[model samples]
Target: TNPDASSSSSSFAVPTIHFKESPFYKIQRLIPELVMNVEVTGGRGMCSAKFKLSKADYNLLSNPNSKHRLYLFSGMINPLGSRGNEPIQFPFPNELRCNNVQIKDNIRGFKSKPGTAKPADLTPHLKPYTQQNNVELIYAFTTKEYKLFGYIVEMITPEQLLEKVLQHPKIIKQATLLYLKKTLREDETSTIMSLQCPISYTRMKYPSKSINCKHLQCFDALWFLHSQLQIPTWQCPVCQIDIALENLAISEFVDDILQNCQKNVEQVELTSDGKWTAIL
Candidate 1:
């Protein structure tokens, strides 16, 4: 199934592939993987609120007692539902903060204060942060049903991430990403294989453009169960026998792209009086 439905404008730059595509032959086909869809309501007075899975549901989705964080993207209007339900947008009135939220290095923080409803400015601050980390900016377009949220272990902490994995009752046989390519090596191979020791970390500087700079750190790992330990009886092209899930050096795979992806948007805050204002 094609996950990309939106088209680019003539003025928009073409996207280049920096990461390797999944080695799947059917690049257009959507692999059937588990997905969790959320329904949110009633945070009518707070700067921001999240709808998370119930303890039972979370346990069902991952290992028991798994910890995770809610990620929110501000500066977007909730797409009206098919039934015509329009949720409030940001730039809240009473000394409140903006609507969008961001996550990095396992720390989940809000862009604005908890109670100040006045449209708070987040651009200058958010710019520096986004420029220093790999962040995905999510938005809502048409209906709440159309809003998409994905679970990847990157933005959360190691402890919390372990909790999410534990919540999954069954051991994940393996996890893999698919992409198409025209190759010189064996004719268009479409198979999954084991990845070498998948967890690792690295260090770098913020505002990466500086010639003289301080160092910042980054962590990487294959959060899949397969990355932790290979089942003695399991065999698949994507996993192998020589490597243990815990030993793979993942730091070598991390790359810095904040300088290239840097772009900012004004956040619209929701007021206590229900008004719209841009948070500079």
Candidate 2:
């Protein structure tokens, strides 16, 4: 059934203009509420267009099928070709205090140790399980019914993601699974329903000054479930051990295939896109 066109007046509903449906339509709808000041910039120069909103209005725009999508044309406000002095930037909360920047840098210095942030820190709370100063990453999960939908695994380790894949078998598997799941999410959005990936902790024995910080010795995973189902994720069905989503890891078999990339780009692309677009 088509959505109520009248409701479009009160809220900004994302219109489905294309022929086919996208699996991420629901999740993308939730984007506006999760963060404020998010900008969807299109066009350039005289043909520029911008979508702007406040924190409250931003969330209102996220409600699914809420009509009232406003499109506005924009022009260059500043004529001067300033190098790095623009007051405006993309992706939300435009006004960042100097103190906040410093605080962010200070907290960033502590991310080498995962899951160490204290509860009462000044870190911004994007997700529920996130903490400040103690760790660089946090895990958040949502489950529905009894099935696992999905989870978001966020980490700040910049130690060459691809390089790590080459050396470590687990890394290869994990990376492969990540790629596989990303494809699955895009292709079988309806049938895939939910997903879960487990990771281990990498605890460092001693602090390393070479990396100029304490090394990560622990690997953790977080489970994210679709909002509709709210499936139960952490409860263990067998021995009753608490099976938190963040603690899961890639299977050994999966790791083997990811390590061996003998199957060229075409084969891998088919697994993800399911159509012949281009070969890398």
Candidate 3:
């Protein structure tokens, strides 16, 4: 297999250990072609890192089709630090970015959001002082299979998803079957349900949740998507689990529950069977 740090010398590979003995690699580390320095800070005094991030080729970061999602990492060059020979600051936005901690395959990544200028003076979380320590200002990327939020929203609108659920008639019945088995304990003579979205106070237009989420709770799809785009955090509002865009699924069973009931009500009660009644 392709092994060894200096072997696959791709044109895109970042500067090597020769540069001031590349602090990241001084500890026998390899920064793969997928990661690159937006900028690095090597200093004699208390070295600080700074960057006007808009300069990098971010189209590669924002473009999901490019098969790369950029992950940002900020770390310090600590000689006593256990891992990288230098301890680095970690302000990762999500867990996916931190998983595996591989700088090898992650030599490169990107996103559409505005450029973020990370000035050490403004927001430096690291509280260590090893004067003359270097900084790894890095943006690493990797191929992503998950479709973009916009593309997902367009293709799987409430109408499209429900139609999808309806056309796939087998999908329709499974929700009820799945619910009854779980609810009744194989069990509820009665339980409450909401017709409104957890994010938006209005009635749910597209009732959906992650397939991995707890049952009986669903949020509106559009409201959820809009929220992610406007702010951004792909998590289940009901159960608070990290939900990928692709993980979102329209609940055919919940649609059935919605249909089984009416629009005037915000909440309802479910009998042991699949039928729902208004809670008002």
Best by TM-score: 3
For each of the candidates, the C-alpha root-mean-square deviation to the true structure, in angstroms, is: 24.1, 22.2, 14.3
Please give each candidate's TM-score: 0.19, 0.17, 0.45
Report, for every candidate in turn, its global Cα lDDT versus the true structure: 0.25, 0.24, 0.44
Error of 2 at 238 (Å): 4.8
lDDT order of candidates, top first:
3, 1, 2
lDDT per residue (tens digit) for residues 1-280 in model 1: 3336556543334332111111110112111121223233333222232233333333322433433322221222234231122221322222222224432212222223232211122221222211221222232222322122223222233344334323433211121011112111336222221112223211221111011111111222222332222222212122323322223222211122222222331133332222233333
Given candidate 3, what's the lDDT at residue 58?
A: 30
Better-scoring candidate (lDDT), 2 or 3? 3
Model 2, 160-268: lDDT tens digits are: 2223323332322344345555656654231121011222112111111111111111111221112101232334322334433233333332233224433332222
Who wins the lDDT comparison? 3
Residue 256, model 2, lDDT: 33
Residues 153-203 of candidate 3: C-alpha lDDT, one tens digit per residue: 011233343444334323255665667657777422677778888899888
